[PDB]
Amino acid sequence: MIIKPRIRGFICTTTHPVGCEQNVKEQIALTKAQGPIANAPKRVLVVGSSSGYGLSSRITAAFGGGASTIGVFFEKAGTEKKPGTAGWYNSAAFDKFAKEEGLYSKSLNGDAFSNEAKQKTIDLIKEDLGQIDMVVYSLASPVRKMPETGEVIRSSLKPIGETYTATAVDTNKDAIIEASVEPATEQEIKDTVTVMGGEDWELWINALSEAGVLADGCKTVAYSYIGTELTWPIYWDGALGQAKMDLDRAATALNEKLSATGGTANVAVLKSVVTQASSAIPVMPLYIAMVFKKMREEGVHEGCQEQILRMFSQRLYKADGSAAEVDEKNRLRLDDWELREDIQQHCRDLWPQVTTENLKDLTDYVEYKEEFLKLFGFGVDGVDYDADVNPEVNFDVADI
Hints:
By secondary structure, the chain is α/β, with parallel strands linked by helices. The chain is built from 13 helices and 14 strands. It has helices at residues 17-34, 52-65, 86-100, 115-126, 186-196, 199-209, 232-235, 239-259, 283-297, 304-316, 341-350, 359-362, 365-375; strands at residues 7-8, 11-12, 43-47, 68-73, 105-109, 132-137, 143-145, 152-154, 164-169, 176-181, 214-224, 264-269, 332-333, 397-399.
């Protein structure tokens, strides 16, 4: 068929299969250009491997470190009459290129929170790789079906205590507005820790030890975010702040466990990036447009690929083998460039002066929307969008 973009606001109900493959191609080319990571792990599991940091995690490990990779995700294949989700083609394109290079690549598609997800992974590891030496926990679901009870829990992006009011950009008018978010209830906060904390991370690690498929010295990392003071009432003091609290607790527990045979567990705090959910909080497109413009000017701008490459080659698996620099809570900090003072101070100074009228001058907002469209495979360069495209695209993936 011929694939349009059906997009109003920041909901895009359409994906472009080749644009997505072209996006994996660019990220792969970027990692290869940095050269092999001498000390990188060889048998890598990525729980949540189909987009954003998870996809770049799988790409770094395979195409920068030469690793065999198993990835877990929940995507929707495309039929002849309906394109699938970006994550489906992202994964399919990964498999294509990894297999073209002789790298092991298997993928499991389903509910990564379910007990069955851990079993099919334990089994699949046992058929070839035998053991895993790194687990990337990069799930980004706002929803968790509890593995014992079937109850469906969703997280909430709300402050705690008081209302959160901030400047924001209105959708599809590009008009500066004031957005408000109500405080979380006592149950919405629990539920956020349940979905976005470290419980399911610990379930993956603990179940994988109890099958023997965790290699001695295995390291595991989960991804988090601290953000600017513009979003402290959600990401630090809000419902999601209690979740990240819980991820710290899990990392401490997991780090003690794997420490037995020399391994580690860390939370990695990553930078602001444009993702399919990033436009949830209303201030985030406004802030991201502004700080991306400054960070481009200072030459410190990065995407998801560069972030995970730097985590690999400048934190976890450094050429000289020296230990990763961590913060006081034993977290890796890859948001160190974005949270530099001259960068943050620039946003602080410009923030009161942003208007509908100077939006495109003070911020890279028109670029923001292009990058957001790039998530679903549109606006990409090596693609003729008038070409017919088959949305049915298969690869080495098994359900459940």
